[PDB]
Design a protein around this ligand. Structure first.
Ligand SMILES: [Ca+2]
Lengths: 299, 299
């Protein structure tokens, strides 16, 4: 159930935080408490054939999933309102900007520091996967920071518009997501599961370390072909300062066969995320991110 | 190659006619002639990773295809300008609005009259397929009229944003288009050809006669499933006045196997389009379009 009231009776609506093509997000403040939040206005789809808005069934799904999740690295749902046109989700305010845009301003970044941000993401996704929840839209712009003005920023995974609970012995197939970041089973219209998220993590890791994107072609047709042929390389132009541990981590994620891809638990336990001896920790410490190419590709 | 000049040096730019995600159209008039056209501004994509704009390569392809086609049922290109941000296609002015919107305002409509509009579409597609051009975006909003105010409106296929030349021995695969109208090979990411256009015609015919949509589900996920298993029917609620010839036409278009689907020439020869005896033509004349459900689903 959604509250059948005028949201603006209870919240002062403020400046825009961004706007997808299916939602508009704005700062707000609950009048009764004075606490700040984000108000995510979702336009309800008015007809079955319509390409505008979202069908209330999928909004309900997003809400149902948000309600199950409480974790430091996952956006927190506060409330839901509804009128004739929109459903409005009141969500924890995540104002710190994107992770990538924080990194783009660093003057130095080691793999050690890099892995510490990546672990925050793995913690969030581990939590969802344990609850059998697939995010299905992991990509830099859904990786945000609470506050970009503290020494080590806190990551929050946002936007559960495509998230889905995965049911055993129940097949889920659909096509969606940003081509650059989708797993081969999405392009190939094959059974989807928690594995797609793991693929995305590899692609995001690849970009964070190097500035390059593994499968991105000159056109979408090219991107999809690269994905499905699992066609990519570790160009020395961009990867010459990247550790073998890093590449091994990536290599084990960018795999077509869903059952051979590292799970979230295995990713957390990979030596590049969780060194098992001093030697590995030193190597990681001595490997640097390609800030120069990273900054360049992301501006 | 595109004229590297300021479009408005040569045209008076008028009112906005329409706009999509990747183009905006304004009415215009060439100064030297006084003749009117439509100026289609297409924003150039500025980076490979960017999701905004169209890459020049695909704009070139669209232009390249339009320059090859002169046929009374196909929009006719006049010129192309280019500036810093945009490529501007100067195109024949098609002002009569959408075919569907005109049908929806109709009092009565027989299958004989319906096949008359469908034939116009088949003529345009036949011309295209002869030249090995696949349109790849056959759907209602891309089927316009020159003048809705004459007894028998003149149909014009528009929007070659997705059109592609099909090369023998060259595999083309991609994912695109409107879910309601895409063939199974698009959804399954299989080799694409001229056959996809024939599927689309099937769907459009289904809708035109009945007002209902063969594969339309409650969500995209469902639409994609229906398409792939070719799951549809002729609900008597809507098809009770529709001839067996019409349904046979649709049946032979909505087939999964690309090799068994009717080609464009076979469509053109189908008895529902091209009756061989007085008996068939009577039946057509006596079967009525479901204007009532049609108006409802589209207006
Ligand atoms: Ca497939």
């Amino acid at each position: 159930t959604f509250k059948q009231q005028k949201v603006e009776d209870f919240y002062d609506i403020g400046e825009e935080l961004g706007s997808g093509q299916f939602a508009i997000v704005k700062k707000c403040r609950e009048k009764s408490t004075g606490l700040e939040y984000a108000a995510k206005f979702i336009k309800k789809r008015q007809s079955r054939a319509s390409r505008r808005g979202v069908c209330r069934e999928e909004i309900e799904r997003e809400v149902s999933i948000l309600r199950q999740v409480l974790h430091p690295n996952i956006i927190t749902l506060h409330d839901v309102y509804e009128n004739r046109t929109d459903v409005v989700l009141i969500l924890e305010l995540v104002s710190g900007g994107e992770l990538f845009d924080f990194l783009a301003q660093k003057e130095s970044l080691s793999e050690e520091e890099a892995t510490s941000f990546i672990k925050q993401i793995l913690d969030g996704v581990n939590y969802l996967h344990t609850k059998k929840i697939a995010h299905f839209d992991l990509k830099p712009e859904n990786i945000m920071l609470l506050d970009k003005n503290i020494p080590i920023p806190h990551i929050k995974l946002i936007d559960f518009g495509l998230a889905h609970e995965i049911e055993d012995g129940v097949e889920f197939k659909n096509i969606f997501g940003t081509p650059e970041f989708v797993a081969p089973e999405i392009v190939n219209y094959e059974p989807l599961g928690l594995e797609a998220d793991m693929w995305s993590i590899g692609v995001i890791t690849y970009i964070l370390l190097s500035g390059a994107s593994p499968f991105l072609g000159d056109t979408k047709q090219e991107t999809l072909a690269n994905i499905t042929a699992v066609s990519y390389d570790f160009d020395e132009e961009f990867f010459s300062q990247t550790s073998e541990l890093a590449k091994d981590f990536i290599r084990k994620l960018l795999v077509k066969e869903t059952r051979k891809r590292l799970t979230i638990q295995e990713a957390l336990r990979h030596p590049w995320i969780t060194p098992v001896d001093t030697q590995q920790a030193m190597v990681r410490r001595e490997s640097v991110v390609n800030l120069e190419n990273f900054k360049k590709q992301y501006v």
